């Protein structure tokens, strides 16, 4: 139509595409982070922030894709096709699900503004020549003192 | 963690299960009604309501599954497997997307309280044995 | 002794008997309606209304009868007797459990008065000759407007 | 859904399990004590207390199981199966009815707080190894 | 170092040792008492009293020892050693875990002072010659009236 | 009942799982740091904080498991079984004791909020793919 999923958050899929693809943690790890942090936050009968709302749907999405991987693994004779599809679920669609979970999860943990600033800083920092950039890549601030 | 998608909206998947699987319109239809009613509402830089937000992730999801179907059509050569899998995307996984789309779309066109009393009243209309069922089922409408 | 279960609710077993037996939904369906509507309502450490209180006990009753169906199915050699009893659990005792769940469940969903009025209206409507009754049978009102 | 029957009354089935199975009086006895103490209270057109309400469903239930036993006696011809099943109604399913009846009947004769401190104090009396157990167990009474 | 577990509660391991070892209920029974009484009390994201705090850790301790009994039962060929260790877990370490659960559980149910007074009274009562002590041993008071 | 040990402290075992198993110092080290910092705090007739209380049960526990290891060394004669079991006490069961000790010890040296933002920030440092990870990991310190 189309509808950019981050547009309501002051971001774009092109803004998330600014970071290298070889950046977002595998979806099992993000899910692990969510369950560790916001399980009771999500399983509650109320939207807290739009970020939660987006996040639940994202997780249900990966849950449906996981169900798909199970059915495809269980119900196909050809191994070349079954392997190509089960691998496609995580390699291609998994990049989008990865950035999707990662964006809201970071947005809850730090803030929308902090993540936006981060996408910018890392997007620039990776693009700069090694000689003229700060020695270590930017990370997400939490408790930096004494 | 389980997290019921409707739980934030005062519902449960058990509440949606009251409706028969042969009830929700094909996803293409919900999408068309969505674009017809709430398109500018969705393509907005500001998030309007929680329903819009849930809805957008729903739509983007279905778009991703459609991309999966196109990719399955272009990549796989054998027709038995590609036909079994392209069908599993539409018939099986499509139900979950259908229920969500219908739930928010209807919540938007009428309201949450209307949709909920509706799920209950429809629950009564469906639970009734056929011999004693009213000639017409309840529907949502603004007149009525 | 005896104690009519609905008497505290301003009703009678004879009042529920006014409706045809071929009316109440099978118990799995009622349970489905309960779990869909009042799971969190029932699993809470407090009686909300007497209707809840009656309802929990009713459900525990059907749970005991279901346990009975399992033991009878698992622990008998004769198939004629095992089938006759397992069928008797739902056919005969199941009518009473059906009306029992249905009455409180409707009483919560609409109101005691609304259900009483309904038992009356349907009890009359089924008894009237087809020519002189409204074309469609009464149903339980919820949201009838525009 | 699981819903513990005593949960609304500030108890759990785990709390009742503190009492041994060889503790609750046969259901006929509870019924007799019930009719002796609270019969007019039960046959009342007005619901008195939540305990009465839970109690009535309990009694009506046991009456239904008794009807089941009579029907099993009249319908089945073979004695091995009818004797195994008529016994399963009294010995096995009867325990759950026994605990409920005893719990409310006792809650009525004394009170909830008395019944609860009782379940605890009895829990202590039973948990104790026999060598160190008091000559007499705790009981409920109004004097004492 | 050492740290007496009851010292913060106004007690000592020597104070618990005052009672005969053949007194504390087997750990499955104590756990049963805990789950019956304080399941919702313990599974809550807050320390209520230090007694709860001690108690959770005690239960996790017995849970680890139970896990140990499972691994030792499952992963050893020699039966004399496997039986000697699996029996040692409950016989020796189980006395300490028993008194540990029992002390806090009683401390919650009655009070710290009531349990201290009880350890004293029973410790004396068992030590007195039969002729000159009260006929029945002391028990933990709860609701003694009419 | 499950009861997560950290749940009372605003954490979960899932929150501690963010740290790799090859992260927590051997239990002897935590104990030594404990005696070095909070020994008089622990040997006190008054309970100071919930962390101290949880900590003492943790320490007494590990002491009991160490007694178990000594007893296994003195009782068992066969070396295959005694070596397999004495090792299972240190490597396997030791992890759970390690996490608890480290969690409270660190909560004491710095504070709960510091430890929690730490578990999160470390979660970010670890979740990152190696190619893009910062040259140094976050640590707790009072300067910094």
Numbering used by the authors:
A (entry chain C), C (entry chain C), E (entry chain C): 1 to 146
B (entry chain D), D (entry chain D), F (entry chain D): 1 to 144
What does the paper say about this structure?
HBc consists of two distinct domains: an N-terminal assembly domain (residues 1-149) and a basic, C-terminal ARD (residues 150-183 or 150-185, depending on the strain). While the assembly domain forms the icosahedral shell, the ARD is involved in packaging viral pregenomic RNA (pgRNA). This HBc dimer acts as the building block for core assembly.
Here, by using single particle cryoEM, we determined the three-dimensional (3D) structure of HBV cores assembled from full-length HBc (i.e., full-length core) to 3.5Å resolution and built an ab initio atomic model, revealing differences from the crystal structure of the truncated core. Due to the T=4 icosahedral symmetry of HBV core, each asymmetric unit of the full-length core contains four structurally unique, non-symmetrically related HBc molecules, denoted as A, B, C, and D. The atomic model of the asymmetric unit contains residues 1-143 of molecule A, residues 1-146 of molecules B and C, and residues 1-144 of molecule D. Unlike the single-shelled structural organization of truncated HBV core, which were determined previously by cryoEM and X-ray crystallography, our cryoEM reconstruction of full-length HBV core revealed a ~360Å icosahedral capsid with a double-layer structure. Second, among the four conformers of the asymmetric unit, molecules B and C both have their C-terminal segments oriented differently in the cryoEM structures of the full-length core as compared to those solved by X-ray crystallography of the truncated core. However, our cryoEM structure shows no density that can be attributed to disulfide bond formation between the two interacting monomers in this region of these dimers, even if the cryoEM density map was displayed in a relatively low threshold, suggesting that Cys61 does not form intermolecular disulfide bonds in our freshly prepared sample used for cryoEM. The outer and inner layers are connected by densities around the 2-fold axes. These connecting densities are superimposable with, or in close proximity to, the newly resolved C-terminal residues of the assembly domain of molecules B, C and D in the cryoEM structure, indicating that the connecting densities are the linker region (residues 140-149) of the core assembly domain.
